[PDB]
Every structure is written in structure tokens, then in C-alpha cells.
A paper describes a structure:
Protein synthesis is essential across the tree of life and undertaken by the highly conserved macromolecular complex of ‘the ribosome’. mRNA translation is regulated at many levels, but until recently the ribosome itself was not thought to be part of this control system. We find that testes and ovaries contain the most heterogeneous ribosome populations, which occurs through a combination of paralog-enrichment and paralog-switching. We have solved the cryo-EM structures of three different ribosome complexes purified from complex in vivo tissues; 80S ribosomes from the testis (3.5 Å), 80S ribosomes from the ovary (3.0 Å) and polysomal ribosomes from the testis (4.9 Å), improving the resolution from the only other previous ribosome from D. melanogaster.
Three-dimensional classification of this testis 80S dataset identified a single structurally distinct class of 80S ribosomes, which was refined to an average 3.5 Å resolution. Comparison of the testis and ovary 80S models revealed that the main difference between them is at the P- and E-sites. While the ovary 80S average did not contain any densities in this region, the testis 80S average contained densities that did not correspond to a tRNA (circle). In the testis 80S average no tRNA was found in this region. The presence of IFRD1 suggests that a significant proportion of the testis 80S ribosomes are not actively engaged in translation. In mammals IFRD2 was seen in differentiating reticulocytes, whilst in our work we found IFRD1 in the testis 80S (but not in the ovary 80S), where it could be involved in regulation of translation during the differentiation of spermatozoa, which is central to the function of the testis. This was also the case for RpL37b in testis 80S ribosomes (Supplementary S13).
Author numbering:
A (entry chain Cz): 1 to 217
B (entry chain CN): 2 to 204
C (entry chain Ci): 58 to 113
D (entry chain CG): 80 to 271
E (entry chain CL): 55 to 159
Write the structure that this text describes.
Amino acid sequence: MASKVSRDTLYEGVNGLLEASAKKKRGFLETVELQIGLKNYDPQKDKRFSGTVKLKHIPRPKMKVCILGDQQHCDEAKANNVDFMDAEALKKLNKNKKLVKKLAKSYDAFLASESLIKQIPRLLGPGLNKAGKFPALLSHQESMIGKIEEVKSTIKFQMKKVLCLSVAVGHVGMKSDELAQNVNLSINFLVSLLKKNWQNVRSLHVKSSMGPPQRLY
Amino acid sequence: GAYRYMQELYRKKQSDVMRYLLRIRVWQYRQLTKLHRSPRPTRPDKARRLGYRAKQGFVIYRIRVRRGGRKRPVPKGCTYGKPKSHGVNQLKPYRGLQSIAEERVGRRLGGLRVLNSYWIAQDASYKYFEVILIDTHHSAIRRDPKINWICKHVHKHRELRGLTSAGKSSRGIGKGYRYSQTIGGSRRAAWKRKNREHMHRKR
Amino acid sequence: VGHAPYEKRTMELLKVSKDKRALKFLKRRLGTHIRAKRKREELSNILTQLRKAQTH
Amino acid sequence: KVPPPIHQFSQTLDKTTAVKLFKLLEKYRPESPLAKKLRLKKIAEAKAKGKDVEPKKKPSYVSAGTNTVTKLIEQKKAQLVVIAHDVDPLELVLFLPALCRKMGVPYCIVKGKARLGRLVRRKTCTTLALTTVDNNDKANFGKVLEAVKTNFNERHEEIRRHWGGGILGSKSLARISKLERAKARELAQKQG
Amino acid sequence: RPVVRCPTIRYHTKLRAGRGFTLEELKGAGIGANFAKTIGIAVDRRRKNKSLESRQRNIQRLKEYRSKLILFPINEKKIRAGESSLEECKLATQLKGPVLPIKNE
RNA sequence: UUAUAUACAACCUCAACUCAUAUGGGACUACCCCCUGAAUUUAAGCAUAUUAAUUAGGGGAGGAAAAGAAACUAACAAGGAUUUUCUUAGUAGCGGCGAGCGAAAAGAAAACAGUUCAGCACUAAGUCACUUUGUCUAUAUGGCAAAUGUGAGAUGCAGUGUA
RNA sequence: GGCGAAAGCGAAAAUUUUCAAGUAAAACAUAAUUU
RNA sequence: AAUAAGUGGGAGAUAUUAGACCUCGGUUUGGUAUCGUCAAUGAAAUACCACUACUCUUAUUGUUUCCUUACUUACUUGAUU
């Protein structure tokens, strides 16, 4: 039931990582939808698998971020081209539409100020529990230094309660030698989000937005 | 050499090869007489390691030993006296079955000294062994300053006095703490000396 | 010479089938909690010694 | 049900080839008794004053017996292993094929352990060896190794996976054959 | 008979009576490990010398004696003595004195 | 060469011999080695305990035997085969925790002695036993050769080497 | 042949290659034979 | 759009076509496309694309206080010179 590029059974060794670039059989860019099957990791409890995987080479996820600024968010962030707004987009982000070819849940990762948290689950929350894109308080959302990294592939991922995962982490159109230092350091940053981990899962999964799921030891 | 290999190969006894080679070797060594001369050692690597050589005359015998704990031979009619002594059917010898093998050889062949033995096969009513003997008057063993020591008189019948390898087992001799009682030499000579009343001349 | 039937019946417990009960079986057989510990690593090794060498 | 480390014995190198092997091996009979003396009695008298090392011309003959040979395989020095199959008990020889199949050296299993003893002039010898690569018999040497490589060595890696065995015979055999020689004559009339 | 340092906390000092001389102390003292036995140094090769200073304590014991240990020659040409043949014992000592003391504490 | 149709040659396993040469079975008993093993008694009764891991034992040796060259002690500033005596000590412990039992390390002394195998490599069976012919002398279950005379011996004897 | 730690054995053994008692009898283990 | 497994990524994919280039499919570009990411707006924003696994499903060489019938080579007794 497996394809030619997305290896299912074969626990491939350390020298066959170079074929991870061969998932680009399409021409349009695809978002790598990561997934894994977790044993003894219940997401209904307080273990909410949400973090940030800061990786050295940026595969550029197409991420728009609205930055709520009150004299602390956009003062230093001109080195990374912040939007420079005074948190007035939240007045129109819910209960109405902005313009043509635009939704009201219009981001991938939201970063919020510290002093205007009260309106995030109350007027914005009913538009986000219906969206699932809710900004947490631990997804590197402070904009003291966390804006140079935000366009530098800051992936905020929320958890599904049906034990499936699909979140954009990047693309596979580039060479796997760039992914030789990327996948070797991301999986060290994914297991830090796990608890009491030595080996609770037998094998890993990775998958693009138009490709079959690869698996690798 | 080969001898290290057949060492390691005899060890894997529960396997499929060595469970047949000991299955055939039982229903060869059961249709014969309980005391019986084999020409050659069965296991020639554990004929080595135990003091056998291939010169005339190192003699070998196969014995069968009836295998189980010792029923006190009491006349149907009681071990009389106190209930502490009333036990008949769970008594176990202080001697082995291997030592009981070497005995029934060495009793019977009065003019050949015993060196060791080894297990060769067993089945369920008869554990059975392979004893190494040495004539001590053949010249090829009297000339031999590596094997010559068993020719002395102080080894006459050297396991009816407990002194082979599988005789020294059942005594209990060793060192130190765990083998403390008995450290007088043997085992009975400890209670002689523990109990010794020293009636010194100058009290 | 091949395997042994307490190991050949605990390799089958060790394919997927809860190698705690493998350890509770070797310590029942071998039986000492380091001999059972040091036997479980061997049959873990052999089951992954057939991982591709015994494809064909 | 004799387990498939046996049969390796007694699949034992059919005698179209084995007679050619003993024709080879006769030149590698180990050492003459008298000529051992005749080699060393003339060293002792005549080559006492000569003191030569060069004209020795070490005759390259068989090595005999397992502990010689099992050394000679793990040192990769033997070009041909002959092991008999009449060994008592077995473990003097039993591991020796699965050495030569692992070390790669071509081994043959030849009927007769007394037949091996006759050319080395002892009673029984159970295993020979061949280190000899002299060109006077190298032509026969190649094809006689090309026999044993497919007979044994390239056959060994599917020797082990095969033992049927436990053949009944003859009374218990032909009775159950006589079950089918009559009960099929009930199947000849019912389906007829 | 080498040692000091009897084992336990009672006798830190009063000797177990020295069986050994433990081959490093021979090798550390100019002999002749097999040779020491032929003099009478009692070489017994079961002790696994655990101190520098216990090794020195017996090395200097193995230098005190072997500096007073007179040597008979074999064939009385005596090319490497190291002591003498005019300190042959009749001339020098001939004593066979009785105790070989331990310098005792 | 084996329908059980003959022979040959091996080998293995096994026989037989008023075969040539050898051992074996004493009996002693004080000590010694291995077994096997009560009850009288004591507990103010008695059943575990105690007698006693002993009488009776009961087979096997020597001038001594057994032991014996650490799968040991110890926790230190470390000791170093075994055996025996002194002390530890009637102590730790065992015990119807009753009656009662009961050791060792360390210290002190007597005496002190170390070692050999098996097994990778050690890379020409280098090996033994008789057998007859000399020689060597002796009541040599010898030595030196010899035939290399059988035989043993690669299913391994020898040298080197040993935790 | 067996058994027993041995000594030894409430042994009408019941199995111990010829486990025979054997015959002036031929070849290529004498012949039907005796437990 | 229902009936999005679900729920999130996503803020378009994929396909087609001729053109570009290649020996060629194809991908891309744009046209078009069942929906959909968007809108339609709510409980999941359904497209695109899933690891998972059961309701279970066919099938695979599973040990089993399994069990039942047979087999002979172990073992057992009986019979004969």
C-alpha cells in the first residue's frame, strides 16, 4: 500500500536520508504535514503538544502574523519588518469581514501582548475555538526578542483530539543535505516536548501536503 | 583447535542436534551391562581436562546409577524411637550419584586406580557416567613423570577415602568462612579438635 | 546447533509480545534477574539480526 | 528425524569424483616411514658437514586430524578439506562444514574414516587437509574443486534448510501403501 | 619476610609476619625475581602491593640486605660478584646469626 | 562387492584362549580418610532440642593420613597456601530464645615451599611401550644403540606454557 | 544380566553374547539339536 | 456542497491543455475544472492531503488446562529351542 518515494516499512539507515528531496513530484510548493502515533501520551490531559522548533535553515512557511503592540512589541522589531500596529486589527478580526478574498481567522501563528490577554478568549476565542488557531502563552509570544525568529520559521502547532497531526513545518523542494542538519536537530527539539522519553514510539512519520507519508528510523 | 569447539558444542544440550545425539546414545547405552568397558572415551575433550591421555593404558568404563533419593532401608517396620527419626521417604544421600558411580567401578576393578569421571548421558531412571581408570603397573604409566604420582601407595583406592574430584565435593572442604566448620583437615577432624579438652600441665 | 526451547518460546514473546513477560519467563527459567536480564538482550539482538539479512 | 546438521553426513561425494580425489591424494601421502629415516640419516651423516638450508624442498603433503585442520581453516591456509562421515562420536568433526562454509574454503565429505586412515598409514584419520598448490597436479586440482564447490559449498547454503526423514519401513510402510492399493479401488468404482 | 601494616584498626602497626616480597619490590630493587628465591628472599607472588610507601618500605629492606648478603662465588673467577670472594664468609662473617630482625616498632 | 547369492581388504564394535607378563582380594587398630547413624540421658513431665552431626560404626590407606598454594580475609596505614597450639570466647549467633549449644577474621607462635595440567600459535609426531641383536654392568618391572620388529598414537603423543 | 553407600540379598532366577552338557563332524563362524 | 471520519494544516491544490525545454511523457505558465483553502459563516471552514485503526474484513506461518482419531522408535508385558 506504499509508494516509491514515501517508504513505509523500510527502516532506512543513516546514508539513505538524501532521498527526502524526492517527494517533490509536483511543481507547486507543498506544506510538510508532520504526524506521529503516540503511545502513553494523552492529549486530553495537560500534556498539550505545543512548542517551537527553531531550526537553522528556514524552509519559509508562508506565515502572516498580526502583532499587538503597546510600547513593547514593535519598538525593537523593525529589524525583521514588523507590521507596526497598535493592536487595532483585533477590533475587526472577529464578527465581520475585512475585504474580498480574506477570512476572519487570517493567520497561522498569533502572537499577543501581555496586557491585552483578556480579549483573546472572549471576543476572539469564539472565532478561534471554531478555528483551532488559538494563541497560547508559551508559543514564544512576547516580542522582546521573539520577532526576528517569528519570520524565521516559528511553527506554532495545536493538537487534534482524534490522534492525527497535520501542521506545516516547511517544504521538501530543497536538498536533503540542508535537511541533514534540519531533521537531525528538529527531532531533538520535538522529543523535548515529550515527557519521560527514551523510546515510546517505534517508528516516525513525515508527509507533505501533496505527497504520501514517508517513514524513517 | 577442535577441542575448544566441541567444548562449546556439548554445552548446548537443549538444542536439536545434541538432543538427538544424547537420545540415540541412551538407547545404545541401555541395552548393555551396567558396568562396561568402553575403548575410547566418549567425550574425548572431557577425557582431557580431567587427566586422560591416549597412551596405554588409560582405561574407561561406563556405569549406570539408578537415580533418585535414598530410601532408608528400614524393615518395613519403623525407624524406632523419636519422630525426628521417623523419616523414610525423602532422605537424600550425602554422596553424589557421580561419586556413587566411581565407587561401584573402583570396588570392582581392584587393581586399577580411578582418576575422574564425567557425565555422558541420562534418561530418567538411570543417570549414567564414564569413569577414567589407570593401571598403575603398566610401564608406560610408571615411566611417565606426569602421571606417575597415582602409582604411590598413598592413593590406594583413592575414592573409597573420598579423594578424587567428585569425592572431595561431598565432604565440604574449601575456604574460608563458609567452609569454616570444617577446617581441621577434613570434616570429622574438626569436631575432634573443637571438642578437645586441653588439660594443660600448668593451670 | 540452533536455539533452545525456553529461548525459542521467549523469542516469540519478544517479537512484539510484551517483553516484560519475557523477562518474567527467563527469570522463571534461567533463573536469576541478571541472567534473565542478560538473556533478554541477546534475543533482542537476534530478532534485530534478521531485520534485512533474512529478506531472501 | 535426524536434524539437518545431519544430513550433511551422509551426503558424501558420489564416487565418480571421489576416485579422482584419491588419485590426487596418493602423491600427498604424508611421510614414508623408512624415507623419514633416510631423510634424516643422511642429514645426520652426510649433511652434517654440508649444512644446507636451500635444497630442503619441503614436500607439500596433507595435514591430518581435526585440531590441525581446524587451525588450518581459521588461518585460511587449507585449499581443500576432506572430512569423513563415520566419526564417533560426531563432535570431533560436526562443526567443520559450517566453518568451511563460513571461511569459504572448499570442503568435501568422503565416505570412510578407515579409508582416510589407510593413506596416512594409521588406523583412522577422520579429516585431511590440502595446502598443496604445486603445478604438477594443479590442472586436476581446479576441476576437482569445481566439483566440490557446487556439490557441497554452493549447496551448503540450502543444505541446512532441508530434512524430511523418519522413514518407516518396511512392514509398517507397505501396509499403508496397501491401504491405497485397495481403498482407491473403492475410489475407482464410486467416482466411476 | 617483608611487611609492616597488619590489617585492622587494632593492629595498624603490629605485624602480620610478612610472607611476601611481591615481585614489584624485587623488580624495584635490582634483582632478579627468580634469582631472589635462590638466595633466600622469599619471593611469594601473591601480594598486590597497595602503597607507594609499603613498596618503598620493603625496597629499602631489600637494599639493606643485599648490601650485607655475602655471596659465595661459583667457579671462583667471579667476573660480576657484586660483593666479593675475599669477603667469602670465612674472611668476613661466617656467622649464621640467629634472628634476621624486623627493626621493630 | 552387501537378492542376507561368494570372496578379498580395511575399520569400528565385541568375543574367546591352561596365550606371554602383570596387578587385585591383607589381616592388624591407637592415630587417619569416606560413609552410615540410634537410643540411654538432660530438659526435674515431654514430642523439636539435648545426647551427637557420637557408641554400635565399617568401606579405604600411611608412617603419619587428610589438607594445601585462594572463586580466601577485610574495609585497614591493608593482609596472603595448609595444619597445629595460645588468645579471641563460652563471644557473635543458634535455642520449646527453654534446657542449652557455639564458631571464625584479626593478633601471638610452631613450621614454612612451592607448583603441574586442559585449553589460541608451539608450526614437519619432534612421542611413548615391549620385541629380538649387541653393548653397559647387575639379582636394574635398566641404560646405549640396532632392525626403524610389532604395537600404541592424529578420536592426538611430545616440547614450550597456566588462572 | 540385577540390586544395595557398603556389608551383602524372607532370590519355583524366570532377562545374563556361544549365557549350551555335547559329536573320530565336509567345505565358504560339524550338524537338527540343549537354556 | 451536503454528510469535512474527524479536525487542523492550508489561505489553493490537482488534473487538463498548448507554449517554454527535453529524445519524450510530464511538471510549470495561464485558460478551464467537482467541490472547497476564500465566500457561502457555523459544531468542526470541507479543497488539497492524512498517520491511525476499529464496525470488522478476507488472508498469514498463532503458543495453547486444547481435544479427538491414529502412527512406532522409546518404554512395557506375553510367546517360542
